[PDB]
Design a protein around this ligand. Structure first.
Ligand SMILES: [Zn+2]
Length: 241
């Protein structure tokens, strides 16, 4: 398997967004990291005021950075950026980075050095789903505060059925590694999102090594029958297509 880089992963997200109109695809230019994912989610839900540098208690559409932005969001130029329900973020990690400056410098240079995972925010199900094909590649000390802080902040905005502001549930769905090589993480998380969007209770099967390879190959072999057809020339250019 040729690995999938940020552009290949983003291409699959755009492909999925053509099938699932509720799916928000984040920046095509900057992947998220454990240090930046909460800020990215809050800004995409219009819950962040860059002028006070403050989290908002309710969305404020005047804070929107999705319009007229053809570097990060050419695919949102003609959408209502508010109208989405499922937000899926490719998340880049390297274990040698211990602060945002280190993680960012490393990411900017590279995004077998990269590891890719996925954070999904599902507003309808009040859940934050974290997918890592290697299960625990990211130290809990780094990923858990981010997942739980997002869950807590979004619970205060999207109430539960009891009328309470309970945190969204966090689901770290892979307990046993499914990935068998050093390079296929981007393909795995793309397959996961594909299946999740048809069934949010989906969890990939535990497979032998050879079976997993055949499984991934089967997924890859669908891709040529699934061209992107609704994207603007600007979006296609950013995707490197
Ligand atoms: Zn917006």
């Amino acid at each position: 398997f040729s690995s999938w880089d940020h552009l290949e992963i983003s291409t699959h997200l755009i492909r999925l967004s053509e099938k699932h109109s509720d799916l928000f695809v984040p920046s095509l230019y900057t992947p998220s990291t454990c240090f930046s994912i909460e800020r990215a989610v809050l800004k995409d839900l219009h819950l962040y005021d860059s002028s006070t540098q403050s989290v908002l208690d309710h969305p404020d559409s005047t804070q929107c950075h999705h319009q007229n932005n053809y570097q990060d969001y050419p695919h949102l130029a003609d959408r209502d950026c508010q109208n989405f329900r499922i937000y899926a973020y490719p998340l880049w990690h390297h274990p040698s980075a211990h602060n945002p400056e280190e993680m960012n410098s490393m990411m900017l240079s590279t995004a077998g050095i990269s590891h890719w995972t996925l954070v999904i925010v599902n507003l309808d199900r009040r859940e934050v789903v974290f997918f890592d094909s290697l299960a625990n590649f990211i130290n809990n000390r780094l990923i858990d505060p981010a997942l739980n802080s997002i869950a807590t902040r979004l619970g205060n905005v999207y109430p539960d059925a009891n009328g309470a502001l309970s945190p969204f549930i966090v689901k770290k769905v892979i307990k046993t590694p499914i990935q068998q090589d050093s390079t296929s993480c981007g393909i795995w998380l793309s397959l996961f999102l594909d299946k999740y969007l048809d069934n949010p209770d989906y969890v990939p099967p535990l497979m032998g090594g050879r079976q997993a390879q055949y499984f991934l190959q089967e997924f890859l072999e669908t891709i040529p029958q699934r061209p992107i057809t609704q994207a603007s020339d600007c979006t296609l250019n950013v995707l490197g297509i």
